[PDB]
């Protein structure tokens, strides 16, 4: 069901098997480099159940450049691309050893994806920095052009992140908004009284 959907939860404790398979997974995790996830919690996230064939988009910073690569390989992906978002102001000017003009998004592949439009976009994004920890909206169009009409899931998203074709998970979303009947059914089967604790 194409319109936006979301689930306020602790992604650690949600049983994501009820959600199905996705052509694309994107995550902007709270790495431990606020409300944080330890390296072991990040490693233990049940990313593998979410896809059979498709792409993972994994935002990284600092030493998560290395840790995110570990997670990505542990979860069964091969990093095949790395998107760079160059942060500008409203005038298209760029905002320890070096100042940081960019943020990195690792791109991983799992299985044998078929029918994606690889090569439409290039691997650099130039876009206004808005709210803090807020990634740019251009990534959704790049992802839509790469895999049009497929179902997608975002981890650690926030209200502004909800998009058509996307199911958003995060603990700062508002309640539970689900419309795909298969999801609704498996959710009610697994959570008949609508609580998620362990």
């Amino acid at each position: 069901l194409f319109p936006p959907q979301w689930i306020c939860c602790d992604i650690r404790y949600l049983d994501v098997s009820i959600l199905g398979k996705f052509a694309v997974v994107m995550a902007d995790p709270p790495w431990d480099i606020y409300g944080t996830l330890t390296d072991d919690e990040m490693r233990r996230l049940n990313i593998p159940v979410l896809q059979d064939d498709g792409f993972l988009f994994l935002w990284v910073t600092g030493r998560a450049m290395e840790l995110g690569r570990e997670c990505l390989n542990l979860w069964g992906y091969e990093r095949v691309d790395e998107i760079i978002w160059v942060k500008t102001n409203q005038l298209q000017r760029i905002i320890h050893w070096l100042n940081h003009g960019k943020e990195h998004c690792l791109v991983g592949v799992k299985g044998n994806p078929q029918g994606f439009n690889q090569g439409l976009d290039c691997d650099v994004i130039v876009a206004e920095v808005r709210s803090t920890s807020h990634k740019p909206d251009e990534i959704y169009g790049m992802i839509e052009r790469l895999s049009p009409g497929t179902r997608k899931i975002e981890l650690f998203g926030r209200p502004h992140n909800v998009q058509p074709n996307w199911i958003t998970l995060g603990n700062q979303l508002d309640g539970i908004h689900l419309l795909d009947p298969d999801v609704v059914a498996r959710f009610k089967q697994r959570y008949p009284d609508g609580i998620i604790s362990k």
């Binding site: 095949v80 160059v86 690889q118 290039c122």
Partner: protein, 239 residues
């Protein structure tokens, strides 16, 4: 505007639309303190890197990856990983490793860790195509290269933006030298796989295509004997 959509419509890469206190005396102190340029032709695969002394404060490593020759001896990451870089690095020293845009971004991190460094910066060379608006694993068009900065032991930004060089040109932007030199990391600077075209004051350049050599280990070491052994490369010369 959405420059990603714009790139799919017109072919103009998003970076095409980036618009580019002195800090000059620093450059002058760097130039005063710079050793004369030194260079050696050496086939690095067959060459015992230990002959390169003394141990270096900065190593810039630019192995020629196959992916640099799309439309055209290349080094695999297998070959590079087997270089004994830790044998010539000073216990506190820095590395800058050009990794391309493919598997080098993973394998070059393995190299850094193998040689004893931790990555502290990821410098991106973003290439514009204002004058001209393909790995099978690739999901996106690759328009940049990465230079990893490693540290071992106890002003600028992490982006270089220039126009995409013409086909067959493998030169990296000379701006990487300015970034490295502005860190004031020490004066023993080695460039492995440099070329005649990259020789530069303050650097020892070593690579297989150099047509001339002037390197002498004793002469080179004399540039750093007391009282000049711990200069940053950004201080006044010692009288």
């Amino acid at each position: 505007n959405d420059y990603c959509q714009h790139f799919v419509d017109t072919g103009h890469r998003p970076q095409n639309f980036i618009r580019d206190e002195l800090i000059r005396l620093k450059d002058e102190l760097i130039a005063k303190s710079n050793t004369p340029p030194m260079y050696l032709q050496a086939d690095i695969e067959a060459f015992d890197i230990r002959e390169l002394t003394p141990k270096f404060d900065v190593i810039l490593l630019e192995p020629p990856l196959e992916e640099y020759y799309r439309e055209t001896k290349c080094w695999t990451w297998d070959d590079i990983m087997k270089l004994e870089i830790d044998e010539i690095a000073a216990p506190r020293s820095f590395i800058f490793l050009w990794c391309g845009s493919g598997e080098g971004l993973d394998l070059g991190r393995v190299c850094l860790r193998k040689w004893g460094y931790r990555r502290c910066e990821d410098i991106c060379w973003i290439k514009t195509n204002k004058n001209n608006p393909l790995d099978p694993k690739a999901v996106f068009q690759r328009t940049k290269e990465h230079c990893l900065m490693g540290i071992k032991g106890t002003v600028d930004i992490d982006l270089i933006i220039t126009e995409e060089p013409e086909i067959g040109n493998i030169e990296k932007p000379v701006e990487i030298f300015h970034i490295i030199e502005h860190f004031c990391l020490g004066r023993r600077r080695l460039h492995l796989f440099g070329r005649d075209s990259t020789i530069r004051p303050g650097w020892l350049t070593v690579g297989p295509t150099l047509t001339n050599s002037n390197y002498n280990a004793e002469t080179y070491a004399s540039y750093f004997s007391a009282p000049n052994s711990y200069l940053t490369g950004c201080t006044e010369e010692i009288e």
